[PDB]
Amino acid sequence: HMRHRTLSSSPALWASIPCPRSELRLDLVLASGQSFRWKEQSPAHWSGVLADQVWTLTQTEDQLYCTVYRGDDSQVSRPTLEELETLHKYFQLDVSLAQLYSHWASVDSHFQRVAQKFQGVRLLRQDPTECLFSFICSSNNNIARITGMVERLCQAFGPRLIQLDDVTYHGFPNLHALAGPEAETHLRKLGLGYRARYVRASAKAILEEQGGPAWLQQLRVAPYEEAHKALCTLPGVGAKVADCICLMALDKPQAVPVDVHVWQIAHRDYGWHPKTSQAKGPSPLANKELGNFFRNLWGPYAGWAQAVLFSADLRQ
Ligand SMILES: COc1cc(NC(=O)N2CCC(n3c(=O)[nH]c4c(OC)cccc43)CC2)ccc1C
Ligand code: NI
């Protein structure tokens, strides 16, 4: 019935935020494995869910154009001021990425080279619940398969928002929905494998053992290390997943998620080897050391620098 918008099709329905390309490149950000809910449904036009609402996003050299679909049978119109504030905080546009790039570049010749081709790679400020369960899905997995798992999970367990063309959009489920007695079996049938157990288990654990979604908001204001330890108590959440959540949803920019992907970048591009740890490959002690290595080098926004390199390492 209703259709995906472009800036030519329906130019009345869009609003804009002043934002240079040097501060934000959608195509680098929304497909770098931070969020798995965004798709380029037409060229330069990225559609995806954001807090029980669907958006489409496109950009020019110095403006970020955006439009909202409200789903319910309402009068279509441009984004409100509060909705633009939601999108401003999503991209964390208060933070000057230009000044961060040069700061990292001053102590990192490799970064300096990579920073030429890949500008405007910023961290999204994601919902903690959406981020947590998405990254439980990420273990031993790729961007394409994680996207699938998360799209099916939302169709099954989450509320319907709107259909645009063939794509039916669903919001992310609440914790109670994922914790039910049939949830593991449904999730296995939807193709998550062993991850299905961790999804249900952690949902159940956050409610019963920690008190529901407010606990994740407490971890936003708690210090990095306390939040990390707390997350590592959850089923299927280890250091890697806990750091991904810390970095991407709990405002801990120093968090450096360490698995095989930074190991490869650290070793090949920085000549890094674990010094204190004995064995030459990955281990919990060596992984921790590698996170400290990058924090020591780049400073308290170490994770934001990692994203730039990850985004670059994904592009050939
Ligand atoms: C953008 O910034 C971040 C993204 C994450 N995302 C993440 O770990 N995952 C798990 C696997 C990801 N991934 C692949 O499937 N192939 C990858 C690859 O091969 C060239 C290199 C790096 C990540 C890869 C997609 C989601 C973690 C930390 C940062 C700061
Ligand atoms: Ni070597």
From Swiss-Prot:
Cell compartment(s), UniProt: Nucleus, Nucleoplasm; Nucleus speckle; Nucleus matrix
Keyword list, A-Z: DNA damage, DNA repair, Glycosidase, Hydrolase, Lyase, Multifunctional enzyme, Nucleus
GO molecular-function terms, A-Z: 8-oxo-7,8-dihydroguanine DNA N-glycosylase activity; class I DNA-(apurinic or apyrimidinic site) endonuclease activity; DNA binding; DNA N-glycosylase activity; enzyme binding; microtubule binding; oxidized base lesion DNA N-glycosylase activity; oxidized purine DNA binding
Binding site for 8-oxoguanine: 257, 259, 306, 310
Keyword hit for Phosphoprotein: no
Tissue: Highest expression in testis.
Domain of life of the native organism: Eukaryota
Keyword match Protein biosynthesis: no
Catalytic activity: 2'-deoxyribonucleotide-(2'-deoxyribose 5'-phosphate)-2'-deoxyribonucleotide-DNA = a 3'-end 2'-deoxyribonucleotide-(2,3-dehydro-2,3-deoxyribose 5'-phosphate)-DNA + a 5'-end 5'-phospho-2'-deoxyribonucleoside-DNA + H(+)
Protein name listed in UniProt: N-glycosylase/DNA lyase
Name of the gene this protein is made from: Ogg1
